[PDB]
Write a protein that binds this ligand. Sequence first.
Ligand SMILES: *[C@@H]1O[C@H](CO)[C@@H](O[C@@H]2O[C@H](CO)[C@@H](O[C@@H]3O[C@H](CO)[C@@H](O)[C@H](O[C@H]4O[C@H](CO)[C@@H](O)[C@H](O)[C@@H]4O)[C@@H]3O)[C@H](O)[C@H]2NC(C)=O)[C@H](O)[C@H]1NC(C)=O
Ligand SMILES: *[C@@H]1O[C@H](CO)[C@@H](O[C@@H]2O[C@H](CO)[C@@H](O)[C@H](O)[C@H]2NC(C)=O)[C@H](O)[C@H]1NC(C)=O
Ligand SMILES: *[C@@H]1O[C@H](CO)[C@@H](O[C@@H]2O[C@H](CO)[C@@H](O)[C@H](O)[C@H]2NC(C)=O)[C@H](O)[C@H]1NC(C)=O
Ligand SMILES: *[C@@H]1O[C@H](CO)[C@@H](O)[C@H](O)[C@H]1NC(C)=O
Ligand SMILES: *[C@@H]1O[C@H](CO)[C@@H](O)[C@H](O)[C@H]1NC(C)=O
Ligand SMILES: *[C@@H]1O[C@H](CO)[C@@H](O)[C@H](O)[C@H]1NC(C)=O
Ligand SMILES: *[C@@H]1O[C@H](CO)[C@@H](O)[C@H](O)[C@H]1NC(C)=O
Ligand SMILES: *[C@@H]1O[C@H](CO)[C@@H](O)[C@H](O)[C@H]1NC(C)=O
Lengths: 585, 579, 49
Amino acid sequence: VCPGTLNGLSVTGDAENQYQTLYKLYERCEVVMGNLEIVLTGHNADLSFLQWIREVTGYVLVAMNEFSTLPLPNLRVVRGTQVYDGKFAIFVMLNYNTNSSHALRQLRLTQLTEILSGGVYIEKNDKLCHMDTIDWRDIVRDRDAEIVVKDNGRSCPPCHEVCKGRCWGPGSEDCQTLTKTICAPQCNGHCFGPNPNQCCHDECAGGCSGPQDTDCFACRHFNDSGACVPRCPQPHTKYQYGGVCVASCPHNFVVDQTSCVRACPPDKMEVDKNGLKMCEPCPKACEGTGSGSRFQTVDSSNIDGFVNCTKILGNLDFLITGLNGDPWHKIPALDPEKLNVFRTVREITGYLNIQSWPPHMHNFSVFSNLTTIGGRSLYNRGFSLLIMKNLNVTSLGFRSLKEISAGRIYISANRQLCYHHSLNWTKVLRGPTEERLDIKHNRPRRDCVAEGKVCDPLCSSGGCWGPGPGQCLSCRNYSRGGVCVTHCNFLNGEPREFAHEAECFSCHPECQPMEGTATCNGSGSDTCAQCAHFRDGPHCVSSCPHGVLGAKGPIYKYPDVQNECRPCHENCTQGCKGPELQDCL
Amino acid sequence: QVCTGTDMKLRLPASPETHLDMLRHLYQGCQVVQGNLELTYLPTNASLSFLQDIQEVQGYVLIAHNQVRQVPLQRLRIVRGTQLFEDNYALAVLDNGGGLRELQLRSLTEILKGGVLIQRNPQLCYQDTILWKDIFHKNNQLALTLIDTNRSRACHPCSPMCKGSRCWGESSEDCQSLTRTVCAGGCARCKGPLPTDCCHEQCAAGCTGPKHSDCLACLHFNHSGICELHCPALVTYNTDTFESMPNPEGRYTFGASCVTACPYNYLSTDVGSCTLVCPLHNQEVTATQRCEKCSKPCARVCYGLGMEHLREVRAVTSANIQEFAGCKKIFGSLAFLPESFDGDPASNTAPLQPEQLQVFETLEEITGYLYISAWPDSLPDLSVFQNLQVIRGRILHNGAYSLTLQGLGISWLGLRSLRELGSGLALIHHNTHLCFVHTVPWDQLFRNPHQALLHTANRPEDECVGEGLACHQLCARGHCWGPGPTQCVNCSQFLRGQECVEECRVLQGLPREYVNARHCLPCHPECQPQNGSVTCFGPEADQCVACAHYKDPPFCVARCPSIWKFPDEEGACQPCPIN
Amino acid sequence: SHLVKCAEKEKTFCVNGGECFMVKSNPSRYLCKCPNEFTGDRCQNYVMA
Ligand SMILES: *[C@@H]1O[C@H](CO)[C@@H](O[C@@H]2O[C@H](CO)[C@@H](O[C@@H]3O[C@H](CO)[C@@H](O)[C@H](O[C@H]4O[C@H](CO)[C@@H](O)[C@H](O)[C@@H]4O)[C@@H]3O)[C@H](O)[C@H]2NC(C)=O)[C@H](O)[C@H]1NC(C)=O
Ligand SMILES: *[C@@H]1O[C@H](CO)[C@@H](O[C@@H]2O[C@H](CO)[C@@H](O)[C@H](O)[C@H]2NC(C)=O)[C@H](O)[C@H]1NC(C)=O
Ligand SMILES: *[C@@H]1O[C@H](CO)[C@@H](O[C@@H]2O[C@H](CO)[C@@H](O)[C@H](O)[C@H]2NC(C)=O)[C@H](O)[C@H]1NC(C)=O
Ligand SMILES: *[C@@H]1O[C@H](CO)[C@@H](O)[C@H](O)[C@H]1NC(C)=O
Ligand SMILES: *[C@@H]1O[C@H](CO)[C@@H](O)[C@H](O)[C@H]1NC(C)=O
Ligand SMILES: *[C@@H]1O[C@H](CO)[C@@H](O)[C@H](O)[C@H]1NC(C)=O
Ligand SMILES: *[C@@H]1O[C@H](CO)[C@@H](O)[C@H](O)[C@H]1NC(C)=O
Ligand SMILES: *[C@@H]1O[C@H](CO)[C@@H](O)[C@H](O)[C@H]1NC(C)=O
């Protein structure tokens, strides 16, 4: 299994760099999670690493390259979930040198059995033979799909006699095997034999070994422990997650009618239950960017959609073209001050990817209120947090970040980035981290410590996001809001405090300061050791109450010689000096 | 073309005089029966031509105690056996002695579940000539057959043209077709002995061609002419992008076919199933109704007979009538039997009193049926249910009736609020004192094309006239539930507090009123009566034309308040300067 | 080969690299040859590791 590409005929580097990129991505790949694109490959390339590909999720594109054969002898299913030009699942174009010295002559797709979506386009290939000897309608599932196979070869040889007029090449080992156009009238699909009782199961793709839901190459919908099904078992039961049936939904996904999804439907919201989140019949639909969205990066025309956003339903990508503008679409450069619109965001459900930041900003303080980064959508594979090549950034600044729910971290090539060396990632990234951090080529530890770029002495062994108090994951002694201190003002200090969850909280304004012991045990009027002024039952007050309306109407109390308050006579006016009728004002 | 059939088994007709009309209204025009097909206790030469259109029965087929020579079911193709007659039987033909001579079931080629019981019919010919093994489905069945051959008739052998001597009757058109035991390879159904004659694996009765669009009957669900294993989901799932989406082509599951909406009186669900009862941990919600899941502890629900702890209870008695106190909607049925208002020496239960029936005064809706065969002789009407609006009939008495009144000493019905009979037939008979049946606009209460009123043995229309029993002269179109001015369906003039009158007392009279749509309502006590004009514009103290006592600017008041106000020279209340 | 250089009104299609090419092919088809450190259909993304 490997990820696919989406280059659309573009390439990176020279002929050797292009081959080495293609080789490493597909070296031992069986299932391509995206498109398979081979573009401008040289005649000296050894393409034998492609022999293990069995299934392609998107489209297969082979264009403007020169090599004799395309070695895909085991490719059976092309799903076509991504279609080139909106029409074609297989796209083969101009694969020959203009001097005729080298060209593509054979595709060798001898096991290609089913294309589930899209057509076939094979055009302008002067030396490509045997393309009009393939029954392409036996392979393409959709009867309305367009097939264009025309200008391919001139002097091509005939098929081997054993091929019965249908072949991929000049020999018996290259003959085409039919699975649909040779079936009994009753099948309506692929078969494993000519008899009416030898039709494949409806839920199976790429051909079958028997009539059952388990004797199949690949499934069309869900794989339930070997069985191909149109839906997972409903109320034992199972959840629908990414084409398989699972006993429970992953902790980082939200459940919607026994299915695990990245985000809820337009008419539902995420609600926390027991461990898992569920979608219920909403808050502002603050949608994200990147793959699966409307645009690739935050930009001068896109950033305005995040005003008052607290939770981003998707990924958040910052690419070079979203900061410096994009003349091809007439998009002006982004004003760096507009990045403060992200200070209201507390959660990102997908990945955070920062490849460029303004030249005068040395941190990411616009995300200081970010608490959770989700792993529901990842950048390529694995990675949910990506910070790379930011040459002016000295600190990360993620003060509030406590959990990354899933995925891998990529922090690299940031020549100024320093304080992260001290950061204990096991308390931020949920689960084992030994194989998930990939932190390389940032400011060396040697120079970071030698220049004094280290965190405050009150900061715990958990590490920190920057130079000062309040940027630590946890502190050694006490906090006062964000900022950490040596001690609280319990027994001394002009203001006085009490302990709660290792944070300092102030005592009630009416509380008497204590000498040698704690001033108070809470922020309430009835939580202080002694009353500073007057006592009204268990509560300390600045004076005894007058003009108060209760269950019996106006309430008035008078002070005693010890400053405790008592009710006035029932026939008094606006107060009294004592309990008797003659004490009334 | 869809109906639910009946649930009588071998019990006697409730009304032998209307039994044939009951069967005719339920089945006339049906092609698919959603329940059991029961044709029992029929008279000699009954008009049974309305049965000729039935092609599918989802439960069992019971033909019993009939005097007719033939039953016109030649079009019946499939019996699905979702409900069985007794232990493991789907077709039952019992005690039909006149009596039946031929089955004539020419189209019947499939039984999906249950056996065949044909007993004590001393006229029937070919019950022992049919190869019943070709009709039972390929899937594992007990497939038990009990065939009684004691016909006591000189039946002719199957037509000389009938290959293998297998037939349903004496004619050449009566031969059994063999569609399973003659097929090539492993095929469950076919058109003939060749592999090319095999039917698609989703066909049940057989086919006209090899495709899942060529089936005579679908094995699982009919998707608009295409037979399929599952009906399309309402909400789909993308395995590549991890999201759920509405399905533009999604359908609801109803019986053995797909529909775009649930039929009237059925509750939709979030999985596409159309049901009559919501699953455990849900609520019934209106919009059209649907079932929705509980996100917190479910609300208290009132239940009737046939539901929950009352499933085994036949009637309302002094031991359970208190369970309906304060209820507006009852989930279940109500039945009042001779046992309800009499004593039970075995269970030690006291009879119900007229004062205990008042527990239903708050009842507005019944989800099942209302069956009354006994009622106190001191109550001339059914006014205990005067606030009952809707009877859904989701549960029917004997599978046919939603409103039944038998043998009651009632002078008029009195059901003033009743506006809907959602499903089922209405049966009113043997009420020798009951007049006001023809005065009720029954055509405005029924919803389904298969509903009708069946009645006999009630007070004659000539006796209603002789005793002066007719609708009050203010009743719209002459429609009423009883003789009183409070019992009209609607009225041409003013309605007051549910009592129809000629005039609203606005311009004249000692008290004064105002008109609001079709109702006449009293003015606030502080409004001054205006002789020949308007007294008030509503029921409040600040809606008066003039004050009867003192004018306190915000409203008319009996006396100025003591804030402390005083009466002035114009009769108004003003704040006092002394405070 | 089968590629030519993009005209001055077309050259802004590719970013960071700028090596925009046109396929000589009835609809317009735009290519770019990216620097070693850039990828994507317009060369807009950095190459990882
Ligand atoms: C699956 O569902 C489909 C769609 O509901 C269903 O197809 C329907 O079958 C009925 C069967 O009667 C068709 O009804 C016919 O409509 C035509 C219209 O002109 C009438 O002429 C037909 O009349 C015949 O039957 C009458 C019965 O009394 C006779 O009196 C008359 O002389 C004719 O013999 C008949 O009413 C209906 O039109 C089709 N609908 C569609 C869209 O085709 C199908 O049967 C279901 N089952 C299977 C296994 O497919
Ligand atoms: C359905 O999923 C199961 C896994 O749960 C697949 O079984 C695996 O198939 C691969 C194919 O090479 C083998 O290497 C594994 O060893 C198999 N695992 C087990 C437990 O047997 C099965 O092939 C899938 N079937 C379809 C149609 O996708
Ligand atoms: C700082 O980092 C160390 C690893 O270098 C963390 O060590 C963990 O210690 C607990 C003690 O029970 C073990 O169960 C874990 O398995 C250890 N982690 C690893 C990766 O081995 C330590 O938790 C971190 N401390 C803080 C305060 O974050
Ligand atoms: C929501 O957006 C408007 C845009 O002007 C802004 O004024 C307002 O303060 C925002 N609300 C909050 C709660 O931030
Ligand atoms: C973050 O960047 C601003 C930019 O001027 C700078 O003033 C500040 O010192 C940095 N903060 C931290 C905590 O490093
Ligand atoms: C949370 O958001 C507000 C918005 O201005 C900001 O002032 C505050 O510093 C943020 N808190 C933290 C811990 O970064
Ligand atoms: C019922 O049928 C059986 C079948 O052989 C026969 O022996 C028996 O005598 C019949 N019963 C009567 C009352 O004739
Ligand atoms: C009641 O009867 C009157 C007679 O004119 C008519 O205007 C009105 O629409 C009727 N309303 C109903 C609900 O039948």
